[PDB]
Amino acid sequence: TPRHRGIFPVVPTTFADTGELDLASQKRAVDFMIDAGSDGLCILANFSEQFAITDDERDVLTRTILEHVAGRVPVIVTTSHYSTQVCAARSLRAQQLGAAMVMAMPPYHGATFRVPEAQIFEFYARVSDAIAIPIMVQDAPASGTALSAPFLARMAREIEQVAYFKIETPGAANKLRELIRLGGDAIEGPWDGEEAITLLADLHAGATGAMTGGGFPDGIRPILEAWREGRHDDAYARYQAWLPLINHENRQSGILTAKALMREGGVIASERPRHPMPELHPDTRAELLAIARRLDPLVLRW
Amino acid sequence: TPRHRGIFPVVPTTFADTGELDLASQKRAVDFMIDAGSDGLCILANFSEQFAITDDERDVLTRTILEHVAGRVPVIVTTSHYSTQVCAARSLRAQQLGAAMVMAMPPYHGATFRVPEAQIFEFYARVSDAIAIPIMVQDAPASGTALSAPFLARMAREIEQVAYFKIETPGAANKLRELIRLGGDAIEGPWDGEEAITLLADLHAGATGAMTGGGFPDGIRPILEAWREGRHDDAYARYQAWLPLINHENRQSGILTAKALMREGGVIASERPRHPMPELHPDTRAELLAIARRLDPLVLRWAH
Amino acid sequence: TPRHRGIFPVVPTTFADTGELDLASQKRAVDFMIDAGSDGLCILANFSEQFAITDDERDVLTRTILEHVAGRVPVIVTTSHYSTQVCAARSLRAQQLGAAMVMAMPPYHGATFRVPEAQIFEFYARVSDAIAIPIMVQDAPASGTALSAPFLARMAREIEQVAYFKIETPGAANKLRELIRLGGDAIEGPWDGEEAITLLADLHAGATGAMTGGGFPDGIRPILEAWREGRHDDAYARYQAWLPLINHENRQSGILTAKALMREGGVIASERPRHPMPELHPDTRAELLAIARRLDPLVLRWA
Amino acid sequence: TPRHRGIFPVVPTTFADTGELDLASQKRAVDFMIDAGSDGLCILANFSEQFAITDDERDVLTRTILEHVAGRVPVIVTTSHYSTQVCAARSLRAQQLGAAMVMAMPPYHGATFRVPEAQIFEFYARVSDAIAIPIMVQDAPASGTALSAPFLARMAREIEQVAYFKIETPGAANKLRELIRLGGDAIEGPWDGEEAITLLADLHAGATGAMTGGGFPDGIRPILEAWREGRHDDAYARYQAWLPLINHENRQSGILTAKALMREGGVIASERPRHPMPELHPDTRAELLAIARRLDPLVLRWAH
């Protein structure tokens, strides 16, 4: 039924040692993530350090990634912004460059600027009016905005392009359940996130897709396929083998997990974040690689 | 002693009702706020709806407002960004366009992306290295980041351009006291904000400046002047006369207060915020105008 | 047709300087607040430092206060607790001791333990089942819990004893409007709080009551008096006169405001909070009293 | 050299299906957890639904559990309270009843009532003055209170009974590293919590104790002994075997995990929480048992 399912990892934004954009490494990371078996990619998300780049860098990254993908896989372009018209403009521009879908947080700023449900609704409704590609709602703690399942399904029922969801808040499995129950066939893509830390319970809840980290999609995807083909016991076995790595990405190495792995594997030239985001502690990085080496991920032999 | 004191109200961003920047209304807003007696101006702050504008609009507004000010009053340009290098380029770009000062929140994003103290120091340290004009550290709830009074005082003593502070967190008065106690004359500008709702308590604590709303800086400034010259009772009376309007701005009409006042007075073409920021409830606007129509602010008697 | 309206100040808990309960000062505090014109009292709220007392002290305080009030004014007993059965038992006990109303936060603990909307509904429903006095829903930032106006309105329509609301989250005035619009006659008591900092705007929105600080209800009740009688500009003039004291209470001296004023007036023996709650900075205290003295509040000329 | 090391799981508060305390099931949960090899126990913590019980119930449980343990293992009694005097009174009472340690959150209430560092130091200082058994400082997100590693180390070095720490804020591993270096020999017990979700990373950092859930301490303890004996590859292997259960407890079944397992295994009569805490979704429960049934935990095998 749905247009999009499977694993859609987040593409990390690759800087040089100087903090400037490293577009060469950026294309190599996209190519590695496509070779890993990804059904699609998501760019300019919070796991791409979008908060540390400029609007001009956003446009260069959007055109560079989409032109290099060359239609090999569908790309989700994250266009989140407080202003409705800016997000619609970014969504239209991503559409023009070949995006299959846009992902947007609800309109927020910082810790205290929140938007009532009514204006959150109009935000998505107007972004929906301007574009023809599907919209994904990101439900994540970083927005500090409660998006309850009845309201999330409401937007899926009442807004044309709103069909996909990335539920990353605590208790995501039973939120996905309630979302699917209240939205029916309007829920085209009930997806989970958070680096696939709760993937198994979310699959139990009816999740169709996973927006994981970009470091090892080859490890996570056979869980989804085995679950689709009814091989539940194989899905658990693969989830169990890879969970220590997923747990270390979620709890320890964080956003920089995909880049530190890509650096060690020779995929990208630098794993540095943009200052002032803290770099990985050497012990956190050493333990990340020690776990990964036990699992033979493609990132280390690409 | 300090380079800058007095009232530095925030210039709101004037939009057309379509949604685009209304630079014609932007300049009239700047002219009025100068005519209202502002010691300076601050632009692209959170009260300017900066989170709703793009980088290109930021540059157009920085150039337009600074050019139109034409050095009549000093301008603080807010350059906050998570990335240390983006904020450093913005602050340098603001300096080269004529800014007297830059204001920066600590690096943050959303509700959960927070930066440790050691990197926050380096953030302001590297912005300091890039410019020759002073930095104003904004201490406000929107960042969700704790900047202790010792830490703020430490940055003043050890970072060259860090010298001004906008204390807006709860208990701003007693925190200003601590900041001044620990920093001394390294605290070149202990200022408050939050529309001046706590200005009288903050002046007691030693505040020498106030970043207020842009609607009625003329009603608030005599509070600062009377206090500087030891007329505390006149400071109280002016504070009391205007506190209901300050209270209605802080608690009811918020960021849109200045623009609803400017629109009523003919200063600007539209009071609309950029969607999806909620527009004023009709009763909230009417009560705002009704309160302002007891105190004769220039904004309701300027264009005509 | 409401059962309760007007001004209901939160009674502060009076400690001795040793930190133990000072019940003699507690009664004198109650008496002053009644002589100051309170239409009723609310006890054991967060503004009463309830989080710094024990369950036994709560029962000692509920009995002593209600016994001392002797039915002079209606008393709101705050009964908040995460546990549905603990709150219901507290509200029942308060009813049997003479309480006319209970106030309950939504169930919560700390900064992270939250309750889904369906369970918050069941919470207030079973508390309503247990008592025959009305419930006041406290919508305050300390809970960290979002209670939308549609949810609060549905609870008033569907839960018998849910009829009163203390709305003191940001944007209370517009929330009160939507609450009244969606709830209709089920909204028996749309009140505000936060020391009456937004009282004028809330009065415009349809508020019929205010939960203020216990320090100067004589200064604030006339604001409601003029509003109810239609003297809107008289209500504004009174408002402007006392707003600097309300503002210093809201932003500077906080919970301790009523206790510092009562101690200066000789009403109580000690203004100290229970440690580790910070005591008032000496300048914050002097400024509070300098403002108060311009307004001649009864607290400074009672004992 | 330290007085206490190993696994100190939190004892769940056992209720009846009617909501009242089920003390018979409470004693059996204690016996099972001792039978499962716990080096010690912790009672009346947030993982015990302590916020859903009364003071009278707290005292009934403190005396009931301490007497039934009969000194078989040391018990940590969580004495947290906002009031300094109340916490010290609870802590002295716990020590008089045989407690080997007390655990205390920093003083706080709700989402907004916070305490400055100076009075938090004074809070732990005066509690230590009253008691003669060690204090464990709990650093958990439920307090919404920042307790930096320098602040925690300073308390350990300057306050006699502050010697143990439960770190379960985000990034506990790196925080534990800094707390251990900063605190030196005064950190008698750098411990982690959060159901052992980050036990491996925390052990690399130098954690010596783990305060986990109470359902399967027999499965988690070998990870600590393997680390203590320097068998790092073995610690990973047992960690990897039990992580899906640990993860399900941390993200899906939560506080109710220990009670659901204990009820299934016949240890306790009821697994319900006190209303309004949401009961387990039936699918969540079935996934919990299916994962647990793969690891042969004692809780589904318990004869005494």
This PDB structure is determined at a resolution in Å of: 2.2
Contact yes or no for B12/B253 (Cβ under 8 A): no
Q: How many other CB atoms are found less than 10 A from the CB of residue C129? A: 11
Phi, psi of D162 (to 5 degrees): -75, 110
d(CA D113, CA D127): 20
DSSP letter string, chain B: --S--EE-PBPPPPB-TTSSB-HHHHHHHHHHHHHTT-S-EEESSGGGTGGGS-HHHHHHHHHHHHHHHTTSS-EEEE---SSHHHHHHHHHHHHHTT-SEEEEPPS-BTTTB---HHHHHHHHHHHHHH-SS-EEEEE-GGG-----HHHHHHHHHHSSSEEEEEE-SSSHHHHHHHHHHHHGGG-SEEEE-GGGTTHHHHHHTT--EE---SS-HHHHHHHHHHHHTT-HHHHHHHHHHHHHHHHHIIIIIGGGHHHHHHHHTTSSS--PPPTTSPPPPHHHHHHHHHHHTTT--GGGGS--
Q: Which segments within D64-204 are labelled E, that is strand?
A: 75-78, 101-104, 135-139, 162-167, 189-192
Separation of CA A240 from chain center:
22
Nearest to B262 by CA among B50, B27, B8: B27
The A-side interface with C (CB below 8 A) comprises 117, 146, 148
Establish how many alpha carbons lie within 13 A of residue B197's alpha carbon, considering only the half-sphere containing its beta carbon. 24
Nearest to D239 by CA among D220, D217, D262, D215: D220
Three-state DSSP class for residue D196: helix
Nearest to A267 by CA among A33, A106, A59: A33
Number of residues in chain B: 304
Contact yes or no for C198/B251 (Cβ under 8 A): yes
- Domain annotation for chain C: domains and CATH numbers: 6-300 (3.20.20.70)
Q: Which of D56, D113, D274 sits opposite C51 (nearest CB)?
A: D113
Instruction: Please say if D175 is a catalytic residue.
Output: no
Three-state DSSP class for residue C224: helix
Assigned token pair, C253 = 């001296």
Assigned token pair, D36 = 């499962």
Q: Spell out the residues 6+ positions from residue D53 whose beta carbon is closer than 8 angstroms to its own.
A: C83, C86, D13, D21, D61, D274
What b/e sequence results for A28-48 when a residue is b if at least 16 CB atoms lie within 10 Å of its CB, and e otherwise?
bbbebbbebbbbbbbbbbbbb
Assigned token pair, B55 = 């980088």
Assigned token pair, B142 = 């929107």
D106: left (phi over 0), alpha (psi -120 to 50) or beta: beta
Contact assignment for D173 to A240 by CB distance below 8 Å: no
d(CA B269, CA B264): 9
Identify the sign of the CA torsion C149, C152, C158, C163: negative
The DSSP output letter for D15 is B
d(CA A242, CA A293): 11
Query: Which residues, in sequence order, are bridge partners of residue C102?
Result: C77, C135
Phi, psi of C104 (to 5 degrees): -140, 125
Assigned token pair, C71 = 């039915």
Nearest to B57 by CA among B91, B108, B13: B13
d(CA A137, CA D185): 50
Task: Tell me the angle at which helices B257-264 and B282-292 cross, rounded to the nearest 10 degrees.
Answer: 70
Assigned token pair, A5 = 């399912």
Nearest to C254 by CA among C56, C10, C54: C10
Chains that touch B (3 or more CB pairs under 8 A): A, C
Nearest to B57 by CA among A105, A50, A89: A89
d(CA C214, CA C256): 10
Q: Which segments within C83-216 are labelled E, that is strand?
A: 101-104, 135-139, 162-167, 189-192, 209-210
Phi, psi of C7 (to 5 degrees): -110, 130
Nearest to D172 by CA among B262, A281, C263: A281
Assigned token pair, D285 = 């429960």
Contact yes or no for B37/B26 (Cβ under 8 A): no
Contact assignment for A55 to B56 by CB distance below 8 Å: yes
d(CA D119, CA D107): 9
Q: Please name the residue that has the structure tokens 């539209």.
A: B270
Q: Which of A55, A142, A276 sits opposite B55 (nearest CB)?
A: A55
Contact assignment for A117 to C148 by CB distance below 8 Å: yes
The A-side interface with B (CB below 8 A) comprises 19, 46, 51-56, 82-86, 107-113, 115-116, 119-120, 122-123, 126, 141-144, 274-278
d(CA C26, CA D64): 36
d(CA C205, CA D272): 43
Three-state DSSP class for residue C145: coil
Contact yes or no for A203/A172 (Cβ under 8 A): no
Q: Please name the residue that has the structure tokens 């985000």.
A: D170
The C-side interface with B (CB below 8 A) comprises 170-171, 173-174, 177, 197-198, 200-201, 204-205, 236, 239-241, 243-244, 247-248, 251-252, 281, 283-284, 287, 294
- Cα–Cα distances in angstroms (integers) from residue A256 to residues A23, A250, C258, in the given order: 17, 10, 52
Q: Spell out the residues 6+ positions from residue D225 whose beta carbon is closer than 8 angstroms to its own.
A: none
Pairing of strands C6-7, C41-43: unpaired
d(CA A132, CA A127): 10
Contact assignment for B251 to C177 by CB distance below 8 Å: no
Experimental method: X-ray
Peptide bond into A276 cis (omega under 30): yes
Helix (H) or strand (E) holding A287: helix A282-293
What b/e sequence results for D288-298 when a residue is b if at least 16 CB atoms lie within 10 Å of its CB, and e otherwise?
beebbeeeebb
Contact yes or no for D179/D153 (Cβ under 8 A): yes
The DSSP output letter for A102 is E
Q: Which of A56, A84, A141 sits opposite B276 (nearest CB)?
A: A84
- For chain B, the maximum distance between any two Cα atoms, rounded to a whole number of angstroms, is 53
Assigned token pair, A81 = 């912004």
d(CA C189, CA C176): 10
Three-state DSSP class for residue D118: helix
3-state secondary structure C21-47: ECHHHHHHHHHHHHHCCCCCEEECCHH
